[PDB]
Structure formats: structure tokens, C-alpha cells
């Protein structure tokens, strides 16, 4: 055992394309739809719990993850790749930030750190890029509420609202029509549930949808991240 792969597995092709990044993006395209919408007093992130079997307990599989008390993440693409990015995002939020400054990182900086990790898989020796795109929603004192997308390349962009994966083209058009700068958090949740219904084939309820918010503090502060319960989603599906 020598890890002999000390050379890049992502290289520029004659056209200027980085093949593996493009192919990672194709993997993201095949993944289940997830979306994010930013309101004035909160952010919402949502995705479909595409259950691989009905015998599987889909509650045990969390697609929406808490990164810090005020930051949450969702993805489209390869689940195992997402899981290890969440682990590293949680850890880096302590090592390179909380243990130094005594507070959690702001959304943009935690995003930047995740982006860095993904960029390094795009240039380091003997690795493929991550096969996920992340949607990171968060709050911090000086920047307020924010929503970011992070792609396999390591590129990130802040969004008012967006979607990624399967039905993203259609979903983004849907969001463009509905979004305005005066949405309350409940209005954004309502729009998220509408937008997500289009890309979902089968059952559409609190058990098959995962949806979280970055909003008010839930009681040194309380955490702004909150994952909506199966019941809380179903309540809003009656007013749909």
C-alpha cells in the first residue's frame, strides 16, 4: 500500500473543461430536488425524502442537517458525500472558528470553508470531486439572514431563492414568479411546499418531505435553526 495517486484526477481538457467537475454536476442533476427560499425574517430549506425502501425508516436518514445552531444545510446528489461534508463543516466550525473566537462562524465564512474543502477535492492528488451541490441557509448578527449554494467546483453564490437537482430548471422559474423582497417566513414555507410539490411524483406529506428553517431564536441566545416536524408540515399542507 502506497497511495501512489499523488497527481490530479481532475485536469483541464483541450476545450478548457474540467471533466470531473462537469460529471459531478451531472451526478447532482440526477439527484432529488432540493430548494431554498429567503424571507425577510427567516430562510427555509426543503427537499424530498426519497425513501429507498418502505421498510427503511426515513426518519433516520437526515437530508437536512444542522451545521451550527444558526446554520443549516441541505443537498442534492450523492448522500454519502454530503454526510462527510456535514461532518467536516461541523468540525471546522469549531476548530478554525469557535475555539479561536468563542462564537460560531457567520454563514458566509462557514460556506467559504466548505467550498474550500470541495475545491481541494477538485485539485488534490488521488481524489474525485464531491458529487453534491449544497444549499446552506443561515443567520448571523452582522450579516442577518442568508442563503448560499455550493457546487462541486467549490464555487458558491448567494441566493434569494433557488433550487438544485432533478427539477431545478422548472422550480427556479416557479420561484422567480413567486419571490419578492417582502416575504414573511410563513409565506416562504408556503412557496417552498408549492415548488416542491411539482418535482415530487408519489406521496406528498410530512413523512416524505424534509423541511427546516433559520428563523427566530428558540428558547446566551437560542438556536435559530429548526427542523419542522412531520405534523407541522401536514398542518401547512391543509392551507395549500
Amino acid at each position: 500500500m502506497t497511495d501512489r495517486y499523488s497527481f490530479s484526477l481532475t485536469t483541464f481538457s483541450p476545450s478548457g473543461k474540467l471533466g470531473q467537475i462537469d460529471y459531478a454536476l451531472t451526478a447532482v442533476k440526477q439527484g432529488v430536488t432540493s430548494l431554498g427560499i429567503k424571507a425577510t425574517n427567516g430562510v427555509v430549506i426543503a427537499t424530498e425524502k426519497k425513501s429507498s425502501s418502505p421498510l427503511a425508516m426515513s426518519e433516520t436518514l437526515s437530508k437536512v442537517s444542522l451545521l451550527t445552531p444558526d446554520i443549516g444545510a441541505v443537498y442534492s446528489g450523492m448522500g454519502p458525500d454530503y454526510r462527510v461534508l456535514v461532518d467536516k463543516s461541523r468540525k471546522v466550525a469549531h476548530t478554525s472558528y469557535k475555539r479561536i473566537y468563542g462564537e460560531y462562524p457567520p454563514t458566509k465564512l462557514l460556506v467559504s470553508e466548505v467550498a474550500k474543502i470541495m475545491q481541494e477535492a477538485t485539485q488534490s492528488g488521488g481524489v474525485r470531486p464531491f458529487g453534491v451541490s449544497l444549499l446552506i441557509a443561515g443567520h448571523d448578527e452582522f450579516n442577518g439572514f442568508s442563503l448560499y449554494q455550493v457546487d462541486p467546483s467549490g464555487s458558491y453564490f448567494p441566493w434569494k431563492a433557488t433550487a438544485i437537482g432533478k427539477g431545478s430548471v422548472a422550480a427556479k422559474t416557479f420561484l422567480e414568479k413567486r419571490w419578492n423582497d417582502e416575504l414573511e417566513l410563513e409565506d416562504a414555507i408556503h412557496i417552498a411546499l408549492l415548488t416542491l410539490k411539482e418535482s415530487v411524483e408519489g406521496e406528498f406529506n410530512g413523512d416524505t418531505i424534509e423541511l427546516a428553517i433559520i428563523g427566530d431564536e428558540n428558547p446566551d441566545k437560542g438556536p435559530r435553526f429548526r427542523k419542522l416536524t412531520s405534523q407541522e408540515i401536514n398542518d401547512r399542507l391543509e392551507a395549500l
Binding site: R99, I100, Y101, G102, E103, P106, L109, S112, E141, F142
Partner: protein
Amino acid sequence: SDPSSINGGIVVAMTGKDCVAIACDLRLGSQSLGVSNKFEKIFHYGHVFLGITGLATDVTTLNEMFRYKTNLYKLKEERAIEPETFTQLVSSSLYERRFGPYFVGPVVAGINSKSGKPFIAGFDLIGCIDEAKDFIVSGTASDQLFGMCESLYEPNLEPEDLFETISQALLNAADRDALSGWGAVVYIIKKDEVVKRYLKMRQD
């Protein structure tokens, strides 16, 4: 031999009503020999002020180190560091040399730009935080300053009342210390103006 009392000198910081004050003497010596009467011990990174007593090479090094760190902090965060955050940064930075420490006695002073709350803090040489509202003292005449501050101080002083309190605390403490004095500086810090005053004191 004792690194914390080769070069000498003192820093004191106080809170007031919508203001903080931090002050230091100007002496640098080699024990008995006075060398410099222009060795200031208070620095600032944005609106956060940091006094440092102790071994002068470490005072200089830590200033340069916190300038470095707060500059990168600002570039990344797109805002100036706050006193509360900086205090934690100082503590971290000191404790990472736990078993080969900087022989210093740092003192943070500033006003939180968002909340407006006056803030001071002190540390031992390995970064334990003294987080006191009233006053923070440091240096070779720290005992002297503790006494002066405890009897002179009272809460919610107006900027120019506070000036007289911190100045007299510094001056009279310094004059009972062989290794402090040779001049003094007092910063009066408010939410959006800072007044720096050099004091007239005995030059022995």
C-alpha cells in the same frame, strides 16, 4: 531574572457611562537602568484597544501578532473585530503557548459598536480571562493600582470624570513603583471619538 519585571511598566483600564478608558506609563528599562520614556503599551485594532505590560519583546511581538490576526479577521469577516470577540482571540492565542508563554499582562478595552456596551477585560500570561466590569489592572505596580482603583473608582462616570479617576490611579500607583512612570498616556474612548492625553508626572 523574573521576565515580568525586567522592563517594568503598567496598564489600567476602566469603564464609565457610555465610555471606557485605558491608560499606561511610558517606561522601558533594564531593571534599574531607564532606557526609553516613549515606550507606549496601548495599541488598537480598529475600535478595540489592547494594553500590554510585561516583557517588552513579547509586548511588541503580541502587538504585531494581534495586528496580523485582526487584519485577516477584517478581510474575511468584512467588519472590524469587536472587544468580546478579540478578548477570546487573545485568550486562545496566549493559551496556545501554555508551556512556553508570553510573559505579558494584556488588557482589552473598547465599546461594542453594535450594542454600544462598554467592555474591558484582563488576562494572566496563559490566557485566563479576568472579566470585570469595574476595572482591570496590570504590570509591576498592579497591587498599587488595585488599591488606587478600589478606593477611587465608582460606576457610571462621565468621560472627563473617568479621566481624572484613571489618571490619578495610574500616576499615584506608578510613583510607588521603581520600574513604572517616566510619563503616561490616557485614552478616553467613546462610541465614535477617542481622546488620547499624555500626562505630566515626575521623571524619576
